[PDB]
Amino acid sequence: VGSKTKEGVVHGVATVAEKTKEQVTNVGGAVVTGVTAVAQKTVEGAGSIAAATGFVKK
Amino acid sequence: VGSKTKEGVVHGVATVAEKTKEQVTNVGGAVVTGVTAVAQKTVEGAGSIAAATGFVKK
Amino acid sequence: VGSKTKEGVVHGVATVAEKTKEQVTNVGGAVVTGVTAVAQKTVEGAGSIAAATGFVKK
Amino acid sequence: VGSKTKEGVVHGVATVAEKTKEQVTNVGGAVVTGVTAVAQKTVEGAGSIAAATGFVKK
Amino acid sequence: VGSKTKEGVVHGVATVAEKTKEQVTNVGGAVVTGVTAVAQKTVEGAGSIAAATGFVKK
Amino acid sequence: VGSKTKEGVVHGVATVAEKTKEQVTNVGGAVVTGVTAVAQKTVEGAGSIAAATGFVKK
Amino acid sequence: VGSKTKEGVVHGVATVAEKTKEQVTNVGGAVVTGVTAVAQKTVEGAGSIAAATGFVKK
Amino acid sequence: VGSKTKEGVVHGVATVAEKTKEQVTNVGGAVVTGVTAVAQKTVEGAGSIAAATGFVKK
Ligand SMILES: Cc1cc(-c2ccc(/N=N/c3ccc4c(S(=O)(=O)O)cc(S(=O)(=O)O)c(N)c4c3O)c(C)c2)ccc1/N=N/c1ccc2c(S(=O)(=O)O)cc(S(=O)(=O)O)c(N)c2c1O
Ligand SMILES: Cc1cc(-c2ccc(/N=N/c3ccc4c(S(=O)(=O)O)cc(S(=O)(=O)O)c(N)c4c3O)c(C)c2)ccc1/N=N/c1ccc2c(S(=O)(=O)O)cc(S(=O)(=O)O)c(N)c2c1O
Ligand SMILES: Cc1cc(-c2ccc(/N=N/c3ccc4c(S(=O)(=O)O)cc(S(=O)(=O)O)c(N)c4c3O)c(C)c2)ccc1/N=N/c1ccc2c(S(=O)(=O)O)cc(S(=O)(=O)O)c(N)c2c1O
Ligand SMILES: Cc1cc(-c2ccc(/N=N/c3ccc4c(S(=O)(=O)O)cc(S(=O)(=O)O)c(N)c4c3O)c(C)c2)ccc1/N=N/c1ccc2c(S(=O)(=O)O)cc(S(=O)(=O)O)c(N)c2c1O
Ligand SMILES: Cc1cc(-c2ccc(/N=N/c3ccc4c(S(=O)(=O)O)cc(S(=O)(=O)O)c(N)c4c3O)c(C)c2)ccc1/N=N/c1ccc2c(S(=O)(=O)O)cc(S(=O)(=O)O)c(N)c2c1O
Ligand SMILES: Cc1cc(-c2ccc(/N=N/c3ccc4c(S(=O)(=O)O)cc(S(=O)(=O)O)c(N)c4c3O)c(C)c2)ccc1/N=N/c1ccc2c(S(=O)(=O)O)cc(S(=O)(=O)O)c(N)c2c1O
Ligand SMILES: Cc1cc(-c2ccc(/N=N/c3ccc4c(S(=O)(=O)O)cc(S(=O)(=O)O)c(N)c4c3O)c(C)c2)ccc1/N=N/c1ccc2c(S(=O)(=O)O)cc(S(=O)(=O)O)c(N)c2c1O
Ligand SMILES: Cc1cc(-c2ccc(/N=N/c3ccc4c(S(=O)(=O)O)cc(S(=O)(=O)O)c(N)c4c3O)c(C)c2)ccc1/N=N/c1ccc2c(S(=O)(=O)O)cc(S(=O)(=O)O)c(N)c2c1O
Ligand SMILES: Cc1cc(-c2ccc(/N=N/c3ccc4c(S(=O)(=O)O)cc(S(=O)(=O)O)c(N)c4c3O)c(C)c2)ccc1/N=N/c1ccc2c(S(=O)(=O)O)cc(S(=O)(=O)O)c(N)c2c1O
Ligand SMILES: Cc1cc(-c2ccc(/N=N/c3ccc4c(S(=O)(=O)O)cc(S(=O)(=O)O)c(N)c4c3O)c(C)c2)ccc1/N=N/c1ccc2c(S(=O)(=O)O)cc(S(=O)(=O)O)c(N)c2c1O
Ligand SMILES: Cc1cc(-c2ccc(/N=N/c3ccc4c(S(=O)(=O)O)cc(S(=O)(=O)O)c(N)c4c3O)c(C)c2)ccc1/N=N/c1ccc2c(S(=O)(=O)O)cc(S(=O)(=O)O)c(N)c2c1O
């Protein structure tokens, strides 16, 4: 019962970022800026890769 | 009972970002800016890759 | 019962960041800026790779 | 019952960061700036790789 | 008399070759197979980048 | 008389070769297989980057 | 008379070769297989970077 | 008369070769297999970086 399982895989990626200026200003919240070539696999779990989750209150 | 399973896979990607200026200003909330070549596979789970989830209140 | 399992894998990545200036200013919250070639696999667990999770209150 | 298990693996990565100036200013919160070629595998555990988790209060 | 001169330049390239098998058989001649991101600039010269130049005779 | 001269330049390149098998068989000639990120600048000269130049005779 | 001269330059390169098998068989000629990130600048000279130059005779 | 001269330069290179088997068989000729991050600058000279130059005769 031979079973192969290629899951949550990422291969053969090539990004090129040319940026003269890159700022992230944050006042009161969350920021999630740059993600590249990210992989995940959960079992009885909750995956949440890029989750900027803000709560401003008073 | 040989079963192959190629799931949640990402391969052969090539992005090129040329940006003279890139700003993200945040006041009170959330931001999720740049995601590229991201993969996921959950089992009994809730996947949520890029979720900027704000709550401004008073 | 020979089973192979290639899960949560990341291979063959090549990023190139050319940036003249890159600032992250943070006042009251969270920031998660640069992630590249990150992998994960949980079992009875909750994976959460890049999670800037802010709570501004009073 | 020969089972191979390549999980949470990261191989063949080559990043190149050219940055003339890179600042991270933090006032009251959290910051998580640069992650590259990071791998994880938990069993009965909660993986959380890059989690800038802020709580500003009064 | 300020003169800028961006000549013979190549920047921001990202190729991705996925090939299961790649053969080059040569019997009597020339072959020039793979060129990528190549640049040149001659002055009183003859540029000739990829020149497979065969002469079969008797 | 300030003159800048960016010539014969190559920057920001990222190739990714995934090849299961790659053979070059040569019998009587020339072969020039893999060139990547190559640069040149001659003055009173003849540039010739990849030149497989065969002469089969008798 | 301030003159800058960025010539024959190569910077910011990142190649990734994954090859299960790579053979070069040569019988009677020349072979030039793998060149990467090579730079040159001649003055009263003849540049010739990858030149497999065969002469089979009798 | 301040003149800067960045010529024949190579910087910021990162190659990664993963090869299960790599053979070069040579019978009667020349072979030039692996060159990476090579630089040159001649004045009244002839540069010739990778030149497999064969002469089979009788
Ligand atoms: C993209 C880019 C931006 C800037 C630059 C310049 C100024 C600046 N802000 N300045 C401020 C700000 C505020 C001021 C304020 S306030 O806001 O009220 O507080 C007040 C006052 S005042 O009351 O005293 O009047 C000021 N004076 C303020 C002020 O001066 C900022 C933010 C940015 C400069 C240069 C620039 N880019 N340069 C170029 C220029 C050339 C580039 C060239 S080339 O040489 O032309 O071939 C090529 C290339 S490429 O090959 O890579 O494509 C480039 N990328 C080139 C390039 O990027
Ligand atoms: C990367 C880069 C940054 C900037 C730049 C310049 C200034 C600056 N802010 N300055 C400020 C700020 C505030 C001031 C204020 S305030 O706001 O009230 O506080 C007041 C006053 S005042 O009342 O006294 O008037 C000021 N004077 C203020 C002021 O001066 C900042 C923030 C940034 C300019 C240029 C620049 N890039 N340069 C170039 C320029 C050239 C580049 C060239 S080339 O030589 O042209 O060929 C090539 C290449 S490439 O090969 O890599 O493509 C480049 N990348 C080049 C390049 O990047
Ligand atoms: C950077 C920057 C910041 C602010 C700023 C400063 C103070 C401030 N006050 N905070 C308050 C105050 C009161 C609060 C009160 S109250 O008193 O009862 O009313 C209550 C409550 S509560 O109930 O929630 O408890 C609060 N939370 C209150 C509160 O948070 C706040 C809110 C903000 C403002 C402006 C600012 N400017 N940023 C700059 C500044 C400069 C920039 C420049 S320069 O070179 O300097 O010219 C250039 C450039 S660009 O050309 O590149 O785009 C920029 N983008 C620049 C830039 O972005
Ligand atoms: C950097 C910077 C910071 C701020 C700043 C300063 C103070 C400040 N005060 N905080 C307060 C105060 C009071 C609070 C009160 S109260 O007293 O009862 O009213 C109550 C309450 S509560 O009830 O919630 O408990 C609060 N939370 C209060 C509170 O949070 C805060 C909130 C913020 C403001 C501005 C600022 N400027 N930054 C600059 C400054 C300069 C920048 C320049 S330059 O070169 O210098 O020209 C350039 C550039 S750019 O071209 O590259 O974009 C910039 N972006 C620059 C820039 O961003
Ligand atoms: C760096 C920097 C800092 C601040 C700054 C300073 C003090 C300050 N005061 N704190 C307060 C005060 C009161 C609080 C009060 S209250 O009194 O009841 O109201 C209550 C409460 S509470 O209820 O929460 O307990 C608080 N937490 C309060 C509080 O935190 C705060 C909040 C902030 C401000 C500005 C600032 N500037 N930064 C600089 C400064 C300079 C920068 C320069 S320069 O070369 O110097 O020109 C250049 C450049 S760039 O060109 O490269 O972008 C910059 N970015 C520069 C830059 O970013
Ligand atoms: C020359 C030659 C080549 C091969 C052969 C077969 C398969 C193969 N690839 N294998 C696979 C397979 C699976 C892959 C999987 S999976 O399915 O999920 O697990 C995934 C992935 S991936 O994740 O990376 O996408 C892969 N890349 C996989 C993959 O590459 C490769 C690269 C090469 C096989 C044989 C071969 N030549 N054999 C010869 C050759 C000659 C033979 C000759 S003769 O000399 O020509 O007369 C005679 C005789 S006989 O008379 O005795 O019958 C023979 N038996 C001869 C003979 O056997
Ligand atoms: C690889 C291969 C080679 C040849 C082959 C062998 C000998 C040969 N003889 N040479 C002669 C002979 C005489 C000359 C004469 S004469 O005697 O007066 O007439 C004169 C003159 S002259 O006047 O110019 O001086 C000559 N030059 C003469 C000359 O050059 C020559 C010319 C060629 C033949 C076939 C051959 N097969 N190749 C293979 C062989 C096998 C291949 C296989 S397998 O696994 O092995 O089954 C598979 C596969 S694939 O499925 O992947 O496509 C392949 N492609 C395979 C493959 O390509
Ligand atoms: C590898 C291979 C080589 C040749 C081969 C062998 C001998 C040979 N003889 N040369 C001669 C001979 C005589 C000359 C004469 S004469 O005696 O007066 O007539 C005169 C003159 S002259 O007047 O010009 O001076 C000459 N030049 C002569 C000459 O050049 C030559 C030219 C070539 C032939 C075949 C060959 N087989 N290779 C194989 C063999 C096997 C291959 C296999 S396998 O696994 O083994 O099944 C598989 C595969 S694939 O599936 O991957 O494609 C292959 N491609 C395989 C493959 O390519
Ligand atoms: C020349 C030759 C080569 C090989 C051979 C077979 C497999 C192989 N690779 N192995 C694997 C396998 C698994 C990998 C796995 S896994 O599955 O998850 O565990 C993972 C990974 S990864 O993580 O790095 O991606 C791998 N890289 C794995 C991998 O590389 C390599 C590199 C090479 C085998 C044999 C061989 N030649 N053998 C010959 C060769 C010739 C033989 C000849 S003859 O001279 O040609 O006439 C005759 C005869 S006979 O008459 O007695 O039958 C023979 N038996 C001959 C013979 O046996
Ligand atoms: C490797 C290999 C070699 C040859 C081979 C052997 C001898 C040979 N004879 N030479 C001659 C002879 C006579 C000359 C004459 S004459 O006598 O007057 O006619 C004249 C003249 S002259 O006038 O120029 O002076 C000459 N030059 C002559 C000449 O050069 C020559 C020419 C060639 C042949 C085949 C060969 N096979 N190679 C193999 C062999 C095996 C391969 C195998 S295996 O595992 O072993 O099954 C597998 C595989 S693969 O699956 O991975 O593709 C392969 N590719 C294999 C492979 O490539
Ligand atoms: C390794 C190998 C070598 C040769 C081979 C052997 C002898 C030979 N003889 N040379 C001659 C002879 C006579 C000359 C004469 S004459 O006597 O008057 O006729 C005249 C003249 S002249 O007038 O020009 O002066 C000459 N030049 C002559 C000449 O050059 C030559 C030329 C070549 C042949 C085959 C060979 N086999 N190699 C193998 C062998 C095995 C390979 C195997 S295995 O595991 O062993 O199965 C596998 C594999 S693979 O799967 O990985 O591809 C392989 N590729 C293998 C492989 O390549």
PDB file of N, CA and C in Angstrom, chain D residues 3 10 13-14 17 23 27-29 34 36 39-40 43-44 54:
ATOM      1  N   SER D   3       8.946   3.408   6.071  1.00  0.00           N
ATOM      2  CA  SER D   3       8.333   4.708   5.834  1.00  0.00           C
ATOM      3  C   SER D   3       9.382   5.795   5.974  1.00  0.00           C
ATOM      4  N   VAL D  10      14.005  22.330   4.934  1.00  0.00           N
ATOM      5  CA  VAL D  10      14.341  23.476   4.100  1.00  0.00           C
ATOM      6  C   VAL D  10      15.755  23.268   3.589  1.00  0.00           C
ATOM      7  N   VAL D  13      18.734  26.973  -0.314  1.00  0.00           N
ATOM      8  CA  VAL D  13      18.291  28.357  -0.233  1.00  0.00           C
ATOM      9  C   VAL D  13      19.513  29.243  -0.377  1.00  0.00           C
ATOM     10  N   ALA D  14      19.359  30.371  -1.062  1.00  0.00           N
ATOM     11  CA  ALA D  14      20.454  31.327  -1.252  1.00  0.00           C
ATOM     12  C   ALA D  14      19.854  32.716  -1.435  1.00  0.00           C
ATOM     13  N   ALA D  17      21.004  39.924   0.367  1.00  0.00           N
ATOM     14  CA  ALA D  17      20.451  41.197   0.799  1.00  0.00           C
ATOM     15  C   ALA D  17      21.514  42.259   0.599  1.00  0.00           C
ATOM     16  N   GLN D  23      16.906  50.442   9.130  1.00  0.00           N
ATOM     17  CA  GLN D  23      16.620  50.750  10.522  1.00  0.00           C
ATOM     18  C   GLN D  23      15.294  50.146  10.940  1.00  0.00           C
ATOM     19  N   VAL D  27       8.842  51.795  19.401  1.00  0.00           N
ATOM     20  CA  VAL D  27       8.352  52.483  20.579  1.00  0.00           C
ATOM     21  C   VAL D  27       7.066  51.775  20.958  1.00  0.00           C
ATOM     22  N   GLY D  28       7.116  50.959  22.002  1.00  0.00           N
ATOM     23  CA  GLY D  28       5.894  50.412  22.552  1.00  0.00           C
ATOM     24  C   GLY D  28       5.181  49.365  21.722  1.00  0.00           C
ATOM     25  N   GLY D  29       5.733  48.161  21.627  1.00  0.00           N
ATOM     26  CA  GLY D  29       5.065  47.111  20.886  1.00  0.00           C
ATOM     27  C   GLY D  29       5.953  45.910  20.667  1.00  0.00           C
ATOM     28  N   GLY D  34      13.759  40.082  10.274  1.00  0.00           N
ATOM     29  CA  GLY D  34      14.312  39.272   9.211  1.00  0.00           C
ATOM     30  C   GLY D  34      14.430  37.812   9.557  1.00  0.00           C
ATOM     31  N   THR D  36      14.851  33.926   7.639  1.00  0.00           N
ATOM     32  CA  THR D  36      15.215  33.285   6.387  1.00  0.00           C
ATOM     33  C   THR D  36      15.663  31.868   6.689  1.00  0.00           C
ATOM     34  N   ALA D  39      12.922  26.374   9.948  1.00  0.00           N
ATOM     35  CA  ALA D  39      12.166  25.137   9.834  1.00  0.00           C
ATOM     36  C   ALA D  39      11.692  24.687  11.206  1.00  0.00           C
ATOM     37  N   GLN D  40      10.610  23.913  11.231  1.00  0.00           N
ATOM     38  CA  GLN D  40      10.015  23.538  12.503  1.00  0.00           C
ATOM     39  C   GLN D  40       9.167  22.290  12.339  1.00  0.00           C
ATOM     40  N   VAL D  43       5.038  18.113  17.789  1.00  0.00           N
ATOM     41  CA  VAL D  43       4.125  16.990  17.995  1.00  0.00           C
ATOM     42  C   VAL D  43       3.519  17.149  19.388  1.00  0.00           C
ATOM     43  N   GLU D  44       2.189  17.257  19.460  1.00  0.00           N
ATOM     44  CA  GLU D  44       1.496  17.814  20.631  1.00  0.00           C
ATOM     45  C   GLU D  44       2.043  19.179  21.016  1.00  0.00           C
ATOM     46  N   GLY D  54       1.996  42.418  20.435  1.00  0.00           N
ATOM     47  CA  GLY D  54       2.041  43.625  21.231  1.00  0.00           C
ATOM     48  C   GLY D  54       0.824  43.805  22.118  1.00  0.00           C
TER      49      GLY D  54
END
